[PDB]
Write a protein that binds this ligand. Structure first.
Ligand SMILES: CC(=O)N[C@@H]1[C@@H](O)[C@H](O)[C@@H](CO)O[C@H]1O
Ligand SMILES: CC(=O)N[C@@H]1[C@@H](O)[C@H](O)[C@@H](CO)O[C@H]1O
Ligand SMILES: [Ca+2]
Ligand SMILES: [Ca+2]
Ligand code: NA
Ligand code: NA
Ligand code: NA
Lengths: 209, 201
């Protein structure tokens, strides 16, 4: 029933990133839609990183299988699964486009309908989460250029929040994750600050007095 | 081999297969297994070849049937449609496929170039091509689907890329808006000379 709240002081910036183990040189699972949507969740977690507003990167170090990713040293970029999750807030009403470009090796994106909220004294609690059906799935052909640029545009309402999940896999060597936002003005952004949020948990016993 | 000298068995247009779908089933339209493979188990209602203009937008408040792809009395109100073919252009460059405002749902698959067995009477696509990308769009129950979903890729002149589009109408309006943008920037509704089949020999 409520798609917004007066008190949203518990909203904080950024995607939450989870990095999972992935077998080096596996060019099969990157094309497997079940693996990209759910199967990856069974792998060992390597890192958890919050506060991420600039999600894109293009990393290749011929001399190291690790690199600094999202401010964290020694991340195993060479072979990994990355999951990014959060709530996208539309500022103004209009068509917003999410674009995945030249991905190496593969990525799948999920974008949900507007979340409802429970409104509490100390903040808002989003009720909807885990959209399960993907919109976009892009895969680099083995050993050839990824010329694919794939996008999803939809109308968003000013002030409303939409859950989003992006899954990215690097099987070996270069990790290229190019993820861009086009807002209704036509501006193209690689920085999601003031558009991407988490909602802090609160004590549901004291939601109201 | 990604091409052959003799391709005299190639003909134009998508091949359409229309399958039975239960009216008012708003569950399977959002089931990715159903949209990718499950539909293939349903009863076939129509087979239509030579489909050149694949898009349509049909709603008759007084009838559950309509003319689709020149065929009278197609059960548009509740159906699965599968379009398949091989995409080819003779001009290398960026091509975009776009699905818009789909009612009720659609899933699109685009494969890498197919290899061939070249024979005296024609070419045989080996058609085990790994997927390049896929798109999935679903209309929400309470509103027009605002989604416009597209894929652009650089395609090579003379290469054949398998393409498959699955569309479902669960009830009422069947909106399947599917367009091609070619390297010149022109936006086309007609796919005739961009989509091919290979005849059995
Ligand atoms: C240095 C480089 O570009 N390596 C890419 C690699 O990232 C990709 O995972 C692999 C399989 O497509 O193909 C290689 O050419
Ligand atoms: C006339 C019309 O647009 N009817 C639509 C129908 O096509 C759609 O399948 C259904 C479920 O989303 O919602 C109805 O409002
Ligand atoms: Ca790679
Ligand atoms: Ca419908
Ligand atoms: Na490139
Ligand atoms: Na009528
Ligand atoms: Na046309």
């Amino acid at each position: 029933t409520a798609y917004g709240c007066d008190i949203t002081t518990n909203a904080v910036d950024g995607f939450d990133a989870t990095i999972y183990q992935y077998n080096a040189n596996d060019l099969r699972l990157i094309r497997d839609p079940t693996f990209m949507s759910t199967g990856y969740l069974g792998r060992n977690v390597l890192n958890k990183i919050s506060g991420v507003t600039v999600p894109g990167f293009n990393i290749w170090n011929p001399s190291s299988r690790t690199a600094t990713v999202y401010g964290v040293k020694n991340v195993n970029y060479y072979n990994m699964v990355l999951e990014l999750k959060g709530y996208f807030k539309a500022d103004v009403s209009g068509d917003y486009k999410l674009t995945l470009s030249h991905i190496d090796d593969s990525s799948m994106l999920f974008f949900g309908k507007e979340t409802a909220f429970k409104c509490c004294d100390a903040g808002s609690i989003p009720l909807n989460e885990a959209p399960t059906d993907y919109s976009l799935f892009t895969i680099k052909p083995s050993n050839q250029v990824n010329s694919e640029v794939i996008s999803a545009t939809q109308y968003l309402e000013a002030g409303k929040y939409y859950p989003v999940r992006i899954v990215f896999v690097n099987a070996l060597e270069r990790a290229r994750f190019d993820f861009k936002l086009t807002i209704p003005s036509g501006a193209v952004l690689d920085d999601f600050q003031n558009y991407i949020y988490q909602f802090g948990d609160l004590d549901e016993n004291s939601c109201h007095e």
